[PDB]
């Protein structure tokens, strides 16, 4: 229904904050592809800290487009970032 | 040490035979980055058919410069074949 007021849990290869979490997810809105070097240092980093965020309604469709790629994503994101 | 005559086992989504498991392989050799879009539907896809293949020394390194993102990456190729 939209607007639900709810969180998305996310595991990432680094214990990042929320703000940082946030950069990266609306970061991936001007995200086409991802590169295989990128892809492949994402797809073997451990990702193992939790990390959520309660969604504005505009993360929401964000989140609701991406589906299950957007905790390979963001990690990519962050292997960008970084 | 090369030359070892093993396996690499791979999850598809689809029960594709050993000819065309090798097709896509050699494919990866001119793939630079994964859309967004067929990354989701690989991701999203229930890859539960087994398919290996011995490898030759040629495939080898493919096998070893992927790494890890080698199954999924089978798996975006054949949803870009598809």
């Known amino acids: 229904f ?3 007021k ?7 290869y680094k214990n990042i ?7 990266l997810l609306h970061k991936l809105e ?4 991802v590169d295989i070097d990128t892809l492949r240092r994402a797809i073997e980093a451990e990702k193992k800290y939790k990390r959520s965020i309660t ?3 505009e993360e929401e469709v964000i989140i609701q ?3 299950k790629s957007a905790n390979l994503l963001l990690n990519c994101e962050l292997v960008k970032l970084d």
Chains 1, 2 share one sequence.
């Open 30 to 33: 001007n995200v086409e592809n």
């Open 17 to 23: 904050d929320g703000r940082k979490l946030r950069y």
């Open 65 to 67: 487009r991406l589906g």
């Open 6 to 12: 709810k969180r998305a849990t996310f595991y990432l």
């Open 55 to 57: 969604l504005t309604e």
């Open 2 to 4: 939209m607007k639900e």
